[PDB]
Amino acid sequence: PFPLPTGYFGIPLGLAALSLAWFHLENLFPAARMVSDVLGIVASAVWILFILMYAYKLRYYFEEVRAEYHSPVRFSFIALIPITTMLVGDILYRWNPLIAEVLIWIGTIGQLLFSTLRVSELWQGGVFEQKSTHPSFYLPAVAANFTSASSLALLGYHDLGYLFFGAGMIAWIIFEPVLLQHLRISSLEPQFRATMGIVLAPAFVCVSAYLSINHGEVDTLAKILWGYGFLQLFFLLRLFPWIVEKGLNIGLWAFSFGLASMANSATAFYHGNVLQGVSIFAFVFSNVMIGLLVLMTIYKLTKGQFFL
Amino acid sequence: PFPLPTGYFGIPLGLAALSLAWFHLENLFPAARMVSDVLGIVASAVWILFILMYAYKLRYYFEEVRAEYHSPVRFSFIALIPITTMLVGDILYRWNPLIAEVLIWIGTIGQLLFSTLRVSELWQGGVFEQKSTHPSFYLPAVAANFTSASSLALLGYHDLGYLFFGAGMIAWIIFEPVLLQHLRISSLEPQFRATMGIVLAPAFVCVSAYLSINHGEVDTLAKILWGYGFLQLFFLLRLFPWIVEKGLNIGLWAFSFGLASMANSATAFYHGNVLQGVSIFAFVFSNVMIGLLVLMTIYKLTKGQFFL
Amino acid sequence: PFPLPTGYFGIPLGLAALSLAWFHLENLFPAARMVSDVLGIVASAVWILFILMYAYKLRYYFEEVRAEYHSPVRFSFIALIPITTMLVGDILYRWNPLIAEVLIWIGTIGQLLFSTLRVSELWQGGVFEQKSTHPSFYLPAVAANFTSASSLALLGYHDLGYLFFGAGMIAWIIFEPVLLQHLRISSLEPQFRATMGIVLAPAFVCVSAYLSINHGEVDTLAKILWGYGFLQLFFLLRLFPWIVEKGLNIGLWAFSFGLASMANSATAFYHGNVLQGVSIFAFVFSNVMIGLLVLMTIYKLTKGQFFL
Numbered sequence: 001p002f003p004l005p006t007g008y009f010g011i012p013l014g015l016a017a018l019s020l021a022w023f024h025l026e027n028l029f030p031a032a033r034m035v036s037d038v039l040g041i042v043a044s045a046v047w048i049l050f051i052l053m054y055a056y057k058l059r060y061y062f063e064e065v066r067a068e069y070h071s072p073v074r075f076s077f078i079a080l081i082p083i084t085t086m087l088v089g090d091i092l093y094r095w096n097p098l099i100a101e102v103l104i105w106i107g108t109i110g111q112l113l114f115s116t117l118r119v120s121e122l123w124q125g126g127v128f129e130q131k132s133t134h135p136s137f138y139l140p141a142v143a144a145n146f147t148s149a150s151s152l153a154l155l156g157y158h159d160l161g162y163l164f165f166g167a168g169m170i171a172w173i174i175f176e177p178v179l180l181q182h183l184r185i186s187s188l189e190p191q192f193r194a195t196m197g198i199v200l201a202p203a204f205v206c207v208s209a210y211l212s213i214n215h216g217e218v219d220t221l222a223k224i225l226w227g228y229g230f231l232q233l234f235f236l237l238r239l240f241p242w243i244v245e246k247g248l249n250i251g252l253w254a255f256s257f258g259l260a261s262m263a264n265s266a267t268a269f270y271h272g273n274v275l276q277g278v279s280i281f282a283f284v285f286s287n288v289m290i291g292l293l294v295l296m297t298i299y300k301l302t303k304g305q306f307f308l
Numbered sequence: 309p310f311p312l313p314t315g316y317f318g319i320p321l322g323l324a325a326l327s328l329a330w331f332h333l334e335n336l337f338p339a340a341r342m343v344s345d346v347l348g349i350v351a352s353a354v355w356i357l358f359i360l361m362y363a364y365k366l367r368y369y370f371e372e373v374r375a376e377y378h379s380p381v382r383f384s385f386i387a388l389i390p391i392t393t394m395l396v397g398d399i400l401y402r403w404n405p406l407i408a409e410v411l412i413w414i415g416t417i418g419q420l421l422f423s424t425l426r427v428s429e430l431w432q433g434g435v436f437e438q439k440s441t442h443p444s445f446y447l448p449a450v451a452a453n454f455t456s457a458s459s460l461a462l463l464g465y466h467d468l469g470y471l472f473f474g475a476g477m478i479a480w481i482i483f484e485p486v487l488l489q490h491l492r493i494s495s496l497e498p499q500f501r502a503t504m505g506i507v508l509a510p511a512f513v514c515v516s517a518y519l520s521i522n523h524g525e526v527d528t529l530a531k532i533l534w535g536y537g538f539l540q541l542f543f544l545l546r547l548f549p550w551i552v553e554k555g556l557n558i559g560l561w562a563f564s565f566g567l568a569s570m571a572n573s574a575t576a577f578y579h580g581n582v583l584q585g586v587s588i589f590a591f592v593f594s595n596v597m598i599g600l601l602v603l604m605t606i607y608k609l610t611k612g613q614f615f616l
Numbered sequence: 617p618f619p620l621p622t623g624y625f626g627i628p629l630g631l632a633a634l635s636l637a638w639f640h641l642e643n644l645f646p647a648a649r650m651v652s653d654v655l656g657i658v659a660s661a662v663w664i665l666f667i668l669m670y671a672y673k674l675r676y677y678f679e680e681v682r683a684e685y686h687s688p689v690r691f692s693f694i695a696l697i698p699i700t701t702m703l704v705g706d707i708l709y710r711w712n713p714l715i716a717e718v719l720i721w722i723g724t725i726g727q728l729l730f731s732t733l734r735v736s737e738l739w740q741g742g743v744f745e746q747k748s749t750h751p752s753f754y755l756p757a758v759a760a761n762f763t764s765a766s767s768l769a770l771l772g773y774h775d776l777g778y779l780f781f782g783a784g785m786i787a788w789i790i791f792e793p794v795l796l797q798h799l800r801i802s803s804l805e806p807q808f809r810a811t812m813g814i815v816l817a818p819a820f821v822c823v824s825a826y827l828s829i830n831h832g833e834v835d836t837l838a839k840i841l842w843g844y845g846f847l848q849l850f851f852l853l854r855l856f857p858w859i860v861e862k863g864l865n866i867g868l869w870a871f872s873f874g875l876a877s878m879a880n881s882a883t884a885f886y887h888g889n890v891l892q893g894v895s896i897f898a899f900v901f902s903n904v905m906i907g908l909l910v911l912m913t914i915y916k917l918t919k920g921q922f923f924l
């Protein structure tokens with residue numbers, strides 16, 4: 001027995017998001033559906049396992065959960081649980097809309113309860129410190145709301161989806177200023193540096209959720225978001241040697257949410273005949289990088305250095 | 309004699325804004341007009357009294373005014389004066405558009421002169437400190453511009469209204485990042501905590517002003533704003549026991565601007581047949597809470613603990 | 617011989633931008649074309665000279681360039697080089713679209729390489745300090761992307777232009793919060809104060825680029841941007857005596873980018889019959905102020921206090 005590190009939920013998260021990206025190509029290229037289904041089954045199976053492991057953690061390692069929850073930094077990774085639950089719901093919708101809808105509402109109520117309890121509590125002061133200003137804060141604050149937005153739109157609740165979308169989008173622009181100033185001043189320690197990959201996520205997760213709610217219309221807002229997303233991509237590419245200066249590690253799955261959302265949004269840009277060449281590049285690049293993450297993970301697994 | 313605490317202008321402000329919310333229901337439910345007129349007369353009467361008291365303060369307690377004006381924290385409450393003046397103008401428009409227009413321009417020129425003189429002066433450095441980063445800064449920086457926007461639109465100056473709207477909206481997104489980071493790090497002292505209610509205001513005041521200028525069209529922007537507004541509501545509800553930990557007090561009128569603007573925007577969402585159930589909840593909730601503020605205020609009055 | 621101070625590129629930048637503003641009036645008032653052509657030739661000639669001087673600096677004063685490049689404050693002025701290159705390209709387009717397109721791509725690739733190398737590197741921490749939070753950061757982070765956006769739109773690449781536009785716009789809203797908080801707390805030393813003029817630029821450069829890409833449609837976004845732009849103008853006017861408290865100097869060309877972009881955007885508001893009176897005021901004001909900058913510069917030149 002061992003307590004599951006909560007950040008491992010980033011693995012089914014990235015795979016699930018990538019399943020959904022391929023799903024959106026089925027009308028252009030039918031074989032995409034099989035790729036999507038395989039990714040989606042693997043993501044769902046991994047999610048089931050990790051949920052069961054986390055249930056074990058809650059039952060037998062509760063003080064570990066309590067400590068992560070109260071931490072002004074580590075609490076954020078708990079948001080991966082409802083986020084992945086919703087994405088698995090979105091996958092399962094293709095086979096069973098009833099079960100999908102249950103997972104989606106569980107994830108939505110869960111994430112909103114979580115942020116309402118913990119994100120707001122930080123405003124009491126004295127616990128969160130300047131050094132707590134980490135990219136992981138995007139998970140409960142931003143990513144969870146975007147995921148609710150897109151999932152609720154899937155279920156047909158577009159106007160409710162826009163409320164969650166707005167919560168996420170404005171929360172993003174309200175947090176990022178202080179994050180980037182912090183990064184400029186304070187060197188993020190190597191042990192946290194893989195989480196720089198989460199910096200890729202906001203614009204791409206945002207535009208993917210937006211396009212899910214607005215019927216795939218590639219409009220001025222969507223183009224604006226893509227532009228900032230690619231700026232951040234270029235910055236993170238330049239920074240990649242620094243990010244991995246102490247070595248390649250499993251934390252690099254942090255990048256997968258943004259990469260998968262880049263792939264998803266690319267399918268919509270392509271459908272809309274906007275920047276098709278860029279879209280092809282983005283889709284291929286993101287799949288190659290996630291493919292590398294999978295290969296590195298299988299490698300770590302086949303040597304027993306996966307989870308503590 | 310006593311010098312009027314400037315923050316008391318929040319009382320006619322909240323009542324006036326609530327009058328305007330009910331005014332906007334008259335076409336759906338005719339009895340709303342009487343509720344609106346009663347609220348509007350009470351707000352106007354209280355505003356007259358407080359204006360006269362503040363004129364007395366300027367004449368006989370000028371050094372108190374000077375000190376509040378030069379304070380990098382207390383100056384903000386002075387913006388309540390032109391804000392309330394404009395809202396009373398908006399009320400009076402139903403009876404006398406000429407007098408309304410005079411009040412609206414006085415409030416608009418006044419607030420813009422005030423911010424231009426004092427908000428900009430802060431950029432000289434050395435007076436404002438990190439600890440000065442308070443929710444009250446929204447009043448001169450954000451709320452005053454939104455109120456000009458909506459008031460000018462009432463008078464038919466829609467394009468000028470959009471300029472004030474943009475000034476307010478961008479000023480809001482430019483300030484809030486540093487406010488929330490400050491709240492996270494530094495525990496706001498109990499004596500200032502009721503001003504947390506001002507954190508509710510921006511998104512709702514914003515969308516109410518937007519809907520006033522754009523002919524009540526409930527569009528993507530409006531939905532986005534409502535979503536972030538409700539996020540903040542949920543956060544502030546969770547925080548409410550901490551906000552009042554040292555007891556219930558008259559400062560809780562800080563919440564009334566956001567609550568009244570929630571009510572106002574709800575009437576437009578309802579008219580537009582967008583999220584009608586949420587709109588009903590929002591309208592009823594905000595009225596109940598302001599009703600509680602009024603009851604608590606009458607209580608304080610009937611015991612002589614109103615103004616110093 | 618002497619090493620050219622890099623900030624002098626602000627002179628052809630302001631003149632070039634002003635040429636483009638007058639160009640956009642030719643369809644309303646034909647004589648505007650001659651004014652535009654004169655400004656454009658002067659800007660281009662000054663740019664050629666300064667480029668040659670900077671090439672000399674790279675060849676014979678390379679360690680000076682290295683030091684400015686690695687500085688977390690001084691690096692930003694290097695972005696003036698590709699920005700001016702693109703604006704000169706935009707001017708030359710009226711005479712030779714081939715040469716214009718070459719300059720535009722050189723400036724675009726150059727600025728994007730520059731930011732990708734240097735703006736991202738700051739996120740490694742430990743070099744940039746709180747005191748490095750200066751208005752000049754807008755140049756590589758914001759202004760360069762807006763200039764690419766408008767230049768690429770000129771060439772017919774509207775969707776690519778929107779990507780650069782979005783990168784600039786979101787980068788602006790992400791930086792400004794921390795800049796204004798810094799200005800509030802820390803008094804910017806007189807030697808840097810003329811750079812306060814760069815604070816005028818973002819909203820106006822933004823709306824000018826937006827109107828260049830969206831076919832001159834003066835819409836809600838454009839009006840919103842103008843409103844915040846004028847707020848900042850009013851603030852900077854009030855601050856002007858403090859800005860120049862140690863005397864008038866050549867650094868005041870910092871204001872010219874925002875002033876010229878105010879003039880440019882005014883032509884589009886006027887064409888669109890939106891706020892025509894404000895547009896006339898803005899156009900005349902900005903030209904008078906740049907005219908004053910030119911007169912003060914000729915004065916300094918005719919006395920040998922231009923460049924070190």
Ligand SMILES: CCCCCCCCO[C@@H]1O[C@H](CO)[C@@H](O)[C@H](O)[C@H]1O
Pocket residue numbers: 005006007008009010011013068074077191192195198251252253254255256257
């Ligand atoms: C899409 C986001 C995936 C995030 C995966 C990266 C984190 C996986 O591991 C996480 O790393 C941390 C830093 O050492 C710890 O603080 C966390 O509790 C942890 O589980």
Ligand SMILES: CCCCCCCCO[C@@H]1O[C@H](CO)[C@@H](O)[C@H](O)[C@H]1O
Pocket residue numbers: 065066069070078
């Ligand atoms: C995934 C869900 C994580 C839930 C962990 C909930 C932790 C709440 O734990 C809290 O710690 C408090 C001390 O501050 C005490 O009230 C109690 O120990 C408990 O309420």
Ligand SMILES: CCCCCCCCO[C@@H]1O[C@H](CO)[C@@H](O)[C@H](O)[C@H]1O
Pocket residue numbers: 078079081082110111113114117118121
């Ligand atoms: C992701 C699934 C939803 C998360 C449920 C977390 C429940 C948290 O538990 C709550 O924690 C509070 C502190 O913030 C404690 O003080 C409360 O007493 C407790 O009810």
Ligand SMILES: CCCCCCCCO[C@@H]1O[C@H](CO)[C@@H](O)[C@H](O)[C@H]1O
Pocket residue numbers: 219220221224785786833835836837
């Ligand atoms: C960071 C926020 C950027 C917001 C951009 C909103 C741009 C809206 O601009 C509008 O976009 C709509 C769809 O493209 C249409 O009205 C028009 O094409 C355009 O007027």
Ligand SMILES: CCCCCCCCO[C@@H]1O[C@H](CO)[C@@H](O)[C@H](O)[C@H]1O
Pocket residue numbers: 266267270279280281282283284
């Ligand atoms: C990111 C979205 C990826 C979409 C993959 C598209 C790859 C197809 O490639 C394209 O096929 C077209 C017709 O089908 C050909 O006309 C084009 O020349 C070719 O580039």
Ligand SMILES: CCCCCCCCO[C@@H]1O[C@H](CO)[C@@H](O)[C@H](O)[C@H]1O
Pocket residue numbers: 313314315316317318319321376382385499500503506559560561562563564565
């Ligand atoms: C809508 C905003 C209404 C604000 C009302 C709350 C403030 C009323 O009182 C205010 O409280 C302060 C804090 O103790 C003082 O600093 C102020 O000058 C004061 O008048």
Ligand SMILES: CCCCCCCCO[C@@H]1O[C@H](CO)[C@@H](O)[C@H](O)[C@H]1O
Pocket residue numbers: 373374377378386
């Ligand atoms: C509601 C209006 C409030 C107006 C108060 C104006 C206060 C200006 O007071 C200023 O204090 C300065 C010291 O800094 C001195 O110039 C003078 O005392 C005065 O100009």
Ligand SMILES: CCCCCCCCO[C@@H]1O[C@H](CO)[C@@H](O)[C@H](O)[C@H]1O
Pocket residue numbers: 386387389390418419421422425426429
């Ligand atoms: C709400 C009504 C409008 C407010 C008018 C306030 C007038 C402020 O008064 C001004 O204060 C300046 C400092 O910022 C002083 O230095 C000036 O000398 C003085 O004219």
Ligand SMILES: CCCCCCCCO[C@@H]1O[C@H](CO)[C@@H](O)[C@H](O)[C@H]1O
Pocket residue numbers: 169170217219220221527528529532
């Ligand atoms: C924080 C800023 C959010 C800006 C959101 C702008 C969204 C505009 O998006 C557009 O909205 C318009 C009205 O809904 C219409 O063009 C379309 O429905 C949509 O394209």
Ligand SMILES: CCCCCCCCO[C@@H]1O[C@H](CO)[C@@H](O)[C@H](O)[C@H]1O
Pocket residue numbers: 574575578587588589590591592
């Ligand atoms: C926030 C705005 C509040 C609007 C109050 C509406 C309350 C009316 O209630 C509604 O009446 C409808 C017809 O009039 C009925 O058909 C609906 O079932 C009922 O909910």
Ligand SMILES: CCCCCCCCO[C@@H]1O[C@H](CO)[C@@H](O)[C@H](O)[C@H]1O
Pocket residue numbers: 621622623624625626627629684690693807808811814867868869870871872873
């Ligand atoms: C539109 C922007 C024009 C900027 C021109 C102003 C700067 C010109 O000079 C600049 O001033 C600085 C401050 O002393 C130095 O740090 C720079 O390297 C310098 O060249």
Ligand SMILES: CCCCCCCCO[C@@H]1O[C@H](CO)[C@@H](O)[C@H](O)[C@H]1O
Pocket residue numbers: 681682685686694
């Ligand atoms: C306008 C273009 C400015 C280019 C200046 C490039 C400066 C790169 O200079 C770098 O300094 C490093 C020390 O940190 C060493 O690698 C080398 O000296 C060099 O690579």
Ligand SMILES: CCCCCCCCO[C@@H]1O[C@H](CO)[C@@H](O)[C@H](O)[C@H]1O
Pocket residue numbers: 694695697698726727729730733734737
């Ligand atoms: C404006 C014209 C484009 C600018 C080109 C600048 C080239 C910078 O030069 C680069 O600087 C890096 C540091 O950030 C060095 O470490 C690299 O080795 C070097 O290639």
Ligand SMILES: CCCCCCCCO[C@@H]1O[C@H](CO)[C@@H](O)[C@H](O)[C@H]1O
Pocket residue numbers: 477478525527528529835836837840
């Ligand atoms: C800081 C960001 C402000 C974004 C404002 C977006 C406002 C879009 O609002 C929309 O604007 C479009 C053009 O005016 C049209 O759809 C409509 O007129 C309006 O619905």
Ligand SMILES: CCCCCCCCO[C@@H]1O[C@H](CO)[C@@H](O)[C@H](O)[C@H]1O
Pocket residue numbers: 882883886895896897898899900
């Ligand atoms: C900022 C853009 C400046 C545009 C300059 C316009 C100046 C023209 O001035 C205008 O001429 C009109 C007809 O041509 C007359 O009908 C108007 O009364 C007059 O104001």
